[PDB]
Structures are given as structure tokens and as C-alpha cells.
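Record Protease 3C, 182 aa.
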Amino acid sequence: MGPGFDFAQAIMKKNTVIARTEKGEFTMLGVYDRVAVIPTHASVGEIIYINDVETRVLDACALRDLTDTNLEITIVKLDRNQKFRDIRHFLPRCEDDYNDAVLSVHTSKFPNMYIPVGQVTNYGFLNLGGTPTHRILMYNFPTRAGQCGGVVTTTGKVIGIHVGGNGAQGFAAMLLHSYFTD
Ligand SMILES: CCS(=O)(=O)NCc1ccc2c(c1)OCO2
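=>
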């Protein structure tokens, strides 16, 4: 409808796949080469389904900060025959607050879904499903089961992936440029 949705659509159309694990279907953001991200609670194993194709996992790393606190991001390297468009230059370098964000989801259950979530707070610490978690972004939208892995964007920036909610608020794990240096 406007330039926020324009940027979100551009990311969804080229840089997302549908990931299936034993824990469900997730929106999965491809970042560069064969490297993607998913919420750690997806419990990635040795094999994952990518757009319903059986795919070997070459590496999977559940990220934690230097206090050894959960970040709820898993970085996955996929044995896939095709590279993602490199979008690392759209990742923020530092922790921040944002205005006018969009949460975008693409699954069998929620195809081509775009939610204007509005203002995003650098919330920080969250007890997420009983797990102490850092670098959480919060938005005041009643997000629901099926949105985990959804991409949080502003115009020109890919800032997080949706990891939970409390019925009234939704929570995303930050994406930082420093996670994907090589
Ligand atoms: C807190 C429940 S939820 O429905 O908001 N999000 C799914 C979820 C489930 C288990 C988790 C988790 C997130 O992060 C750590 O363990």
C-alpha cells in the first residue's frame, strides 16, 4: 500500500523460503550465499524441508551473547543448489528503536501476509517461554501462532525475526550485521 510494504514485499519475494522442521512450518529469511536464519525453538536438525524439498543442513549455530544468554536466532547453512540475494547491507550495525515497521510472513497457512506493527522498542531482556533472552524488539500487535520466523523491516532495513508474543505484544530477535561477517 506504501513504501514500507514495498520494501517488505521486495525482501519476501527474493529472500524467504518456507522451512519445515518437526516443530512446524516457519518463515525463513535467507541472508547471503546458502545462509539463512530461523527461531532457535524451530529445533533445526541434520535435515530440514525447504519449500517441501528434503535439504541437508551443512551447519546450524544457536546464537548466544557473550554473557551466554539465548538470542533465539539459529544461523543455518543449507545444502541448496542456489544462493540468496546478498541482503547483509540492509542489516543494522547496532541495537536500536524503530518507527513504522512491517512484519511479513509466508507459510502454507499465512501466504503473502503483511502486518503494519508500528513503533518498535529496544525491549532487551525477555523471559521467552521460560528462557532468559536478550536483544528483544517489542511491537504492540497481537501476533499469533504461525508468525514465528516472520521478517521485521522498516524502509531500507531488515531489523529482526518474530520469535513470540503474549497475546497483546509481539517480540522479535534483533538481526545485526556482525552475525553474518565472513
Ligand atoms: C514463548 C511461547 S511463544 O508462543 O510466544 N513463542 C514460541 C516459543 C516456544 C518456545 C520457546 C520460544 C518461543 O523461545 C524459547 O522457547
